[PDB]
Structure formats: C-alpha cells, structure tokens
Design a protein around this ligand. Structure first.
Ligand SMILES: *[C@@H]1O[C@H](CO)[C@@H](O[C@@H]2O[C@H](CO)[C@@H](O[C@@H]3O[C@H](CO[C@H]4O[C@H](CO)[C@@H](O)[C@H](O[C@H]5O[C@H](CO)[C@@H](O)[C@H](O)[C@@H]5O[C@H]5O[C@H](CO)[C@@H](O)[C@H](O)[C@@H]5O)[C@@H]4O)[C@@H](O)[C@H](O[C@H]4O[C@H](CO)[C@@H](O)[C@H](O)[C@@H]4O[C@H]4O[C@H](CO)[C@@H](O)[C@H](O)[C@@H]4O)[C@@H]3O)[C@H](O)[C@H]2NC(C)=O)[C@H](O)[C@H]1NC(C)=O
Ligand SMILES: Cc1nnn(Cc2cc(C(F)(F)F)ccc2CCC(=O)N2CCC(CCS(=O)(=O)c3ccc(S(=O)(=O)/N=C/N(C)C)cc3F)CC2)n1
Ligand SMILES: [Ca+2]
Ligand SMILES: [Ca+2]
Ligand SMILES: [Cl-]
Ligand code: NA
Ligand code: NA
Ligand SMILES: [Zn+2]
Length: 807
C-alpha cells in the first residue's frame, strides 16, 4: 500500500527514499508505482520543451516551464542547457577547441571534483569509429580525454549483470546478479525483469559505488532512472543537484540511457535505423556538457562515458531447439536465448540425470551452434560457476545464434521481429563496449589498452577518494588512465620461504616401482653439472624472479640445466616450473631407451615423491612432464626431464593436448615471439570458486596413492613486447599470453578431436585463454616479482587477456 495523497512540492527528485506507506518523489518512484499524486505536474514539467529560443531570452519566470530562459535561471540552476548559447552569445561546448585540463577548475565550496557516469545500454565498441561523424560531442570526449579502443564486459553479456559489475567491481558469480532472469533454490524465488521480486535487496550482493560513497561520507545522487523520465529531464535533474548547497550536493552521479540497446534489438547493431539513436545520445551528451559549461563545471567534473555490452546480429531463424536433441524435453527448464541454463522441471523427478542430458547435447549435429558444459568445465576466464543461482548445466551459444526449448517458444512470444541480441561469451568482438574518461583527473589525448569492466569500480573509488570494498579488480592496473589519485600498491609479502635441498638420498632408498635406462657415465663436466644443480643457469630460465608463495606450505626449489621448479612436498609435484626457449632452440624426441623412464630425485625424500606403481595400477590415469623433454638443450640434460619431481598426473585424453602444446606449439611461439619464457603448473579447483584449493578440498587422487589430481593445467608464456629483442635480453615492456586448460578424461569438448591435433588443440587452448591474475587466484602464487618495470605496469600485464579475435 502507498498513501499517494502526500505531495512532491519541494521534493522533486529527492535523494533520500521515504518509506512506505508515504508517497515517493525520487527518480525510481514510477517503477514502484509509488509516486505522489502531483509528481507528474510538479516534477515532469514539459511545457515549452527543452531549448531556449531568442524570443524567451530574459523572459519573466513561469514556473510551469520545463526549463528556464529568464535572467534568474543560472542562480536557480534550472536554465535550459542551451541558455547561454541562445541568450548570451556563448558557444556550445562541442565547438570549443580542446584544452588540457591540468588541474580541477571548480567553484568555491567544491571539496573534490564530482564524478558523472554517463552509461549507455548496448553501445557496441565499434560505434565509436563507425558512428563518429554523427556523434561530435562523444568524439570530442574520446579524442580529448582518455579512451580505450574497447572495454570487455563480464559474462553473461546482459544488462543487469554488467551494470551491477560496473557498480561493484565484482564478477556476477560473486555479486549474485548472474542473469537478467534467475531462480534461487535457497530462497525458492525467481528474479525477472518484469515484476516485484527484483526489488528485494537479498538478490544484490557486494557493495555498489553509491553505498561505498555514502558509508565514507561522500554524498551520491540516485543512479537509477524510471524508464518514463525523458533523458532531457534526467540531465536537468543532475544539473539541478549540482547547484545544491555544499552540504547537500552529491559528488557522484549516474545518467542511464536505454539506447542504443532498445533500437539495436529491433534493427541489428548496424541497421540503418541505428543512426538516429546515436545522434540522439550525442545530443544528450551535448546538453550535459553545455549545462556543465553554464555552471562553470566543464573543467571541474570527471565524466565517464561507458557501456554495459555490445550487440550482435541475431534473428529467430538462427535458433537451435532442444526438442531436436532431447526425448525428455518436457522434464527440463531452460533459461533460453544467447546462453542456455538447464535444470530439472521437478525436483521430485528421480529419473532426471544431467549426464544423460549433456551426452544428448554433445556434438550431435555437424554445424551445431551451441556447446554444453557442466558449469565447472566452462572456461575459467568466464568466472561463471560459484553461485547457487547458476544452473549446473550451461550452454555456450555461438555468436549470432539462440537456443530455445521448443519451436513454439519462438513463434509464440508466424514470424519474428528482432534483429539484434547480446549475452554471448565476453571475448566475442560484437559484445565489446566503450570507455572514455574526460576531466581533470584523467589524462589528456591518451589511448589506453583495452581492459575489463571489473576494474572500473576501483578507479571510480580513486576518483572520489574512497577506499574500495573488496572486489575483483586489481587495484593499480588502471593507474595509467589517471593524471593524479593513482593507487600505489605494494607487492604482497611471501608467506612461505623455500627449502633448497642438496643431494640427500641414495637411489636404493626409493621403492617407487619406477625404472629408467640411465646407467651411462669426467671432472670437467661433473663440476659443470653440479653447478647447474646449484642454480648456475637460473638467470636464463627464471627471468622475472621466482614466484612468491602467498600461503603456508612446505616446498623446495629445484634447479636444473634447462628448467627451475618449486616442488610441493604436500601436493607431491611442482607448483610451478619455469624455462626459457630461445628462437633458435631445437626440438628433439623422447629417445627410445627413455620412453618409460622415471628417475628418483636424490634431493627429495621417497616419502615426498610420486611413484610409478600408482600409475600402473590406475587404469584411467597416465602421466606427463611439466618441463618438456622435447626441448632439452642436450642429450645429457634431457635426463633431468624424466625426474619423478617433474612428473604430473594426466589422463591419456589430456596428454594428447599437452604433448602437442609441448612438442609443437612452444617452439612455434618461440619462433614467432623471438624466444619465450614459460611457467607451467597444476591447478586444483574442485569447488569451482576460482581460488586455490587446500589439501582437504581435493576430490580425486591417483588410485591408491596420495597424489592429488589437478583440475586444470596452466602455462604463462612471456616474451619482449619489442620482438626485435630476445625474451632473455629484453630492456622494456613485456608481452604475455596464458591458458588454464581443463584436465578432462575425454575430449568431448572438441567435436573434431578424432582428427590430427593440428586441427583442434590450438582452438581448445584459445577458448581457455587466461589472465595471469586468474592463475594467481587459482594457485596462490605471485608472478613477475623481479623485473625492471613499474609495479602498476606489471599489474596491467597480469590483467591482460589474449582474446584471439580479429581487430
Ligand atoms: C572476487 O572478489 C570477492 C570479494 O573479495 C571474493 O569473494 C569473497 O571470497 C571469500 C572466500 O570465498 C568470502 O569469504 C567468506 O566470507 C564469509 C562471510 O560472508 C558474508 O559476509 C560478506 C562480507 O559482508 C559478504 O560479502 C558475503 O556475501 C556473499 O553471500 C551473500 C549471501 O549471504 C550474497 O548476497 C553475496 O552475493 C555473496 O555471495 C558470494 O559469496 C559467497 C561466499 O561468501 C558464495 O557462496 C556465493 O555463491 C557468492 O559467490 C556474505 O554475506 C565467511 O563466513 C567465510 O568463512 C568460512 O570459510 C573460512 C575459510 O577461510 C573458514 O576459515 C571459516 O571458518 C568459515 O567456514 C565456516 O563456514 C563454512 C561454510 O558454511 C563451513 O563449511 C565451515 O565448516 C565453517 O563453519 C569466508 O571468509 C567472501 O565473503 C567473498 N565475498 C563476496 C562479496 O563474494 C571472490 O573470491 C573474488 N573472486 C576471485 C575469483 O578472486
Ligand atoms: C542493474 C543495475 N545495477 N546497478 N545499476 C545502477 C546503475 C549503475 C551504473 C554504473 F555504471 F555506474 F555502475 C550506471 C547506471 C545505473 C542505473 C541503471 C538504471 O537506471 N536502470 C533503469 C532501471 C533498471 C531496472 C531497475 S529495476 O530492475 O526495476 C530495479 C532493480 C533494482 C532496484 S534496487 O533494489 O534498488 N537495487 C539495489 N541494488 C543494491 C542494486 C531498483 C529497481 F528499480 C536498471 C537500469 N543498475
Ligand atoms: Ca544492456
Ligand atoms: Ca577452490
Ligand atoms: Cl581423445
Ligand atoms: Na595408468
Ligand atoms: Na571429441
Ligand atoms: Zn539488450
């Protein structure tokens, strides 16, 4: 109930929300059906429109008017945004030459530069270039301020997850808005764009920017706008708030536009009908900037122009139907469209079996346009699993396609209407969106590389002098956007220091069931090999310092001619293995006599070693090596690669992948990049939280042993950004690509896996591309500790994702 008999007189667009049953006058009151009876009359004036004309200049103030052109309007803060242009001979902001904003030029009484977030729904990244002729205000912001070529959204590339990520710095799995539609099995409640459940605060986790601000004494405008409030009124409202007394005036504001998304769905991303929405958004930006100029705030305020996601061509004829694959289609519930999420229709149906559903949806049609996954098997870069609102079965849909349950869902929602959609994998080029920063705190005429939207919350906090709530950004990685207010972090402290074991065990102390034909024998070279075991080549293979271990454990550094490792006594394998392969390196074979060779490591106790008998007995499990024997520097050095301390458990299906990577791709990358440094290792994430498992979280061991089975294998592949310098003699910035491969007992993910590995392995690896930061979370290791480069530059490097998309 709402007693709508209260009044909005003196309350239009009030900032504090008054509680039920009292009636509301805030910018969301319409969405709750809660506005006071006179809200439209008093707060949504439209009389005479949005622009001054020559005949209105110096008029007598008429309070019915939407905006004012009377002499008093500037002091009242309610002039039409073109008032000074029409009535005082001033220029529009867009017609003024760009001039660097070296310091904030703010009115007296401003404690900090305000921040205005100008958010646009469905604003695809390529609109900045492709629409530039029709968007002169936006183009001035972009060219004179700080811009990225694109900004990466979060998956799913839908509106509610992305706007909330922008607000919080959190992945959807952590903030809880995992889709525009959701079922929470604990609440037994459904969240939908239509209806009232979405207003319940229990859905919305983390701490959004407006709350972070308010808790730290920084006043915030209300970010949300009911759809019926015209954009001109949203801008005039912000400009009015900026005219409030110092003790009442907010420091942070958001504008939101439903365009160009609304038209994009109807017309496709580049339909000819899209020009007009882009023009109208640009006009709105011009109103804001002219309005700020009138208030002498255009060189005071920091402006962010930012999108939530892009827009792809999608039509209803490009729909896959689950009814063509499943006999049991009426026993499932599907969340459909540009992603799929499947659960049982009834929790009482004991016949429901996810394994059978997955198999029925796997590689069944030659050009099949979706791929099913258990959520823990999704690419780790999506960070889309650790929430009870995310169904176990997920369908990753190809760009340009939909999935639906039955055809009647698509023609009873007899043809269709729409030409655009979004939601796909967040590395897809059509899903990328925009970022521009303009103001005293941003840099001048500066391009920055693409970055992820999870990073922006920290920067918005920096811009307002706020301490960010705990989030998934890497604070510092966007310092290069800012003139001032940079955040200067310190590297994390190493928690566990390594042991450096020497030769401590005799061969006969080992009873591991291993064998090797290595009984083949010099003072010159005996000293030389001792030096290699003491670390004499470590400078070549450990180029950026050893990784730091950020948790309590027991591990050993092991040195070798061709590679260095940090060997875990607890997990009985390396945490990391580091090696450098020059451009001129030669690939060799595993010699016949060493095919099944595994050698005890006399530096490491039998008790802290793997054993070969476990692998013989485990009929499902084989092994591979972290440092590849194919890339040994010499036949004598190759023996090091068969140490038991370089062995890791691998399913035979996975060994196909790993062997191709090691034998073919590493050398290819070294040839292309002028040497590479590789750091490889295991990952254990049995609870799919994106974080390193403790020992007691491990669900699978090599049969009969205490050898834990990794859920994934990573590699970090680093070289010189200036590829005219070899990786091992690089003077400047670095270049990286990484992956986190799922350690699966089949290659069902790869529909062409019966073919030669040259036709499918690299496609797999691209799908499982990763940031170094992702590997850091999953391992508790901290990389790049010892470089010549600034720490903030290294943080940027660690957040890089190699996406493998064209320009
Ligand atoms: C991305 O950034 C974020 C933010 O930094 C990282 O997320 C954090 O990760 C931590 C580890 O997973 C996690 O720490 C736990 O916090 C528990 C207290 O949590 C509440 O309070 C916080 C603070 O206000 C609040 O933010 C939380 O919000 C979550 O839950 C609500 C629902 O109540 C949601 O609305 C909200 O969206 C959010 O959900 C997300 O996180 C939860 C986990 O908290 C997930 O389950 C959801 O799916 C969703 O992802 C909470 O309201 C605290 O109780 C935990 O302590 C247990 O574990 C430690 C291990 O160190 C152990 O020592 C303790 O004894 C304790 O164990 C006991 O409870 C166990 C479980 O019942 C039981 O098994 C044991 O036997 C013990 O009795 C823990 O410290 C932190 O909350 C989240 N924060 C957020 C915002 O998500 C995230 O990791 C980053 N991601 C990556 C990839 O880097
Ligand atoms: C999602 C989401 N997450 N964060 N935001 C805010 C935001 C953040 C940022 C950025 F970049 F800075 F981060 C820019 C612009 C905005 C404003 C978006 C806006 O005006 N919109 C129009 C209203 C619409 C639906 C509202 S509703 O579902 O009916 C509803 C839903 C929920 C609520 S609520 O209960 O108040 N939500 C509370 N929390 C904690 C988010 C109200 C509501 F009306 C959303 C789009 N939106
Ligand atoms: Ca959107
Ligand atoms: Ca984990
Ligand atoms: Cl296979
Ligand atoms: Na085996
Ligand atoms: Na396959
Ligand atoms: Zn949309």
């Amino acid at each position: 109930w709402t007693a709508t008999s209260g009044s909005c007189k003196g309350r239009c667009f009030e900032l504090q929300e008054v509680g039920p049953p009292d009636c509301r006058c805030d910018n969301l009151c319409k969405s709750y059906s809660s506005c006071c009876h006179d809200f439209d009359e008093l707060c949504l004036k439209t009389a005479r429109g949005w622009e001054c004309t020559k005949d209105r200049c110096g008029e007598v103030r008429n309070e019915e008017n939407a905006c004012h052109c009377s002499e008093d309007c500037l002091s009242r803060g309610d002039c039409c945004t073109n008032y000074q242009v029409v009535c005082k001979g001033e220029s529009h902001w867009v017609d003024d030459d760009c001039e660097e904003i070296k310091v904030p030029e703010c009115p007296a009484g401003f404690v900090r530069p305000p921040l205005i977030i100008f958010s646009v729904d469905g604003f695809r990244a390529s609109y900045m270039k492709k629409g530039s002729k029709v968007m002169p205000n936006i183009e001035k912001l972009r060219s004179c301020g700080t811009h990225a070529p694109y900004m990466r959204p979060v998956y799913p590339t839908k509106t509610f997850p992305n706007l909330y990520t922008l607000a919080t710095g959190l992945y959807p799995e952590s903030h809880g808005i995992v889709g525009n539609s959701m079922y929470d099995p604990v609440f037994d409640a459904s969240f939908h764009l239509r209806g009232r459940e979405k207003f319940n605060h229990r859905w919305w986790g983390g701490q959004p920017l407006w709350i972070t601000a308010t808790k730290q004494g920084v006043r915030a405008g209300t970010f949300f706008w009911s759809v019926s409030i015209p954009h001109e009124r949203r801008i005039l409202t912000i400009l009015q708030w900026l005219s409030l007394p110092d003790n009442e005036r907010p420091s942070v504001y958001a504008f939101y536009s439903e365009q160009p998304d609304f038209s994009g769905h109807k017309y496709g991303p580049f339909g000819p009908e899209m020009t007009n929405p882009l023009r109208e958004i640009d006009k709105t930006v011009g109103q804001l900037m002219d309005g700020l100029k009138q208030l002498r705030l255009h060189r005071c305020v920091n402006v962010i122009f930012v999108g939530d996601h892009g827009m792809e061509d999608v039509t209803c004829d490009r729909t896959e139907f689950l009814s063509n694959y499943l006999t049991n289609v009426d026993d499932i519930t599907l969340v459909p469209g540009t992603l799929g999420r499947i659960r049982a229709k009834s929790i009482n149906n004991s016949k429901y079996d996810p394994k059978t559903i997955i198999a029925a949806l796997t590689c069944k049609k030659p050009d099949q346009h979706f791929k099913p996954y258990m959520k823990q098997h999704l690419p780790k870069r999506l960070h889309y699993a650790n929430n009870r609102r995310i169904e176990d079965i997920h369908l990753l849909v190809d760009r340009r396609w939909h999935v639906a349950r039955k055809p009647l869902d698509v023609y009873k929602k007899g043809k269709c209407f729409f030409q655009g959609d979004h939601g796909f994998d967040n590395k897809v080029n059509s899903m990328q969106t925009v970022f521009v920063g303009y103001g005293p705190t941003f840099k001048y005429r500066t391009k920055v590389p693409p970055f992820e939207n999870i990073e922006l919350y920290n920067v918005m906090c920096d811009l307002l002098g706020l301490k960010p709530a705990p989030n998934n950004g890497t604070h510092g990685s966007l310092n290069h956007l800012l003139r001032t207010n940079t955040f200067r972090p310190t590297m994390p402290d190493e928690v566990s220091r390594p042991n450096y074991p020497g030769i401590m065990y005799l061969q006969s102390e080992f009873d591991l069931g291993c064998t090797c034909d290595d009984k083949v024998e010099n003072k010159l070279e005996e000293l030389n090999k001792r030096l290699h075991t003491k670390g004499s080549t470590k400078e070549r293979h450990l180029l950026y310092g050893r990784p730091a271990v950020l948790y309590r454990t027991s591990y050993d550094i092991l040195y070798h001619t061709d590679f260095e490792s940090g060997y875990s006594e607890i997990f009985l394998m390396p945490l990391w293995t580091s090696y450098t392969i020059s451009k001129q390196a030669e690939v060799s074979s595993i010699p016949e006599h060493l095919t099944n060779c595994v050698r005890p490591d006399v530096r490491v106790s039998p008790g802290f070693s793997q054993n070969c008998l476990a692998y013989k007995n485990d009929k499902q499990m084989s092994y591979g090596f972290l440092f590849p024997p194919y890339l040994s520097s010499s036949p004598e050095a190759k023996y090091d690669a068969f140490l038991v301390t370089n062995m890791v458990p691998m399913y035979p299906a996975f060994k196909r992948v790993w062997a191709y990577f090691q034998r073919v791709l590493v050398k290819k990358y070294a040839s292309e990049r002028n040497g590479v440094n590789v750091i490889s290792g295991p990952i254990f994430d049995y609870n799919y939280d994106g974080l390193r498992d403790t020992e007691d979280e491990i669900k699978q061991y090599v049969e009969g042993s205490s050898i834990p089975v990794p859920t994934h294998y990573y590699s970090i592949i680093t070289s010189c950004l200036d590829f005219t310098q070899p990786a091992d003699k690089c003077d400047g910035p670095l270049s990286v690509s990484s992956f986190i491969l799922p350690h699966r007992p089949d290659n069902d993910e790869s529909c062409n896996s019966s073919e030669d590995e040259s036709k499918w392995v690299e496609e797999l690896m691209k799908m499982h591309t990763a940031r170094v930061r992702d590997i850091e979370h999953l391992t508790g290791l901290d990389f790049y500790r010892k470089t010549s480069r600034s720490y903030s530059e290294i943080l940027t490097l660690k957040t890089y994702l190699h996406t493998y998309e064209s320009e």
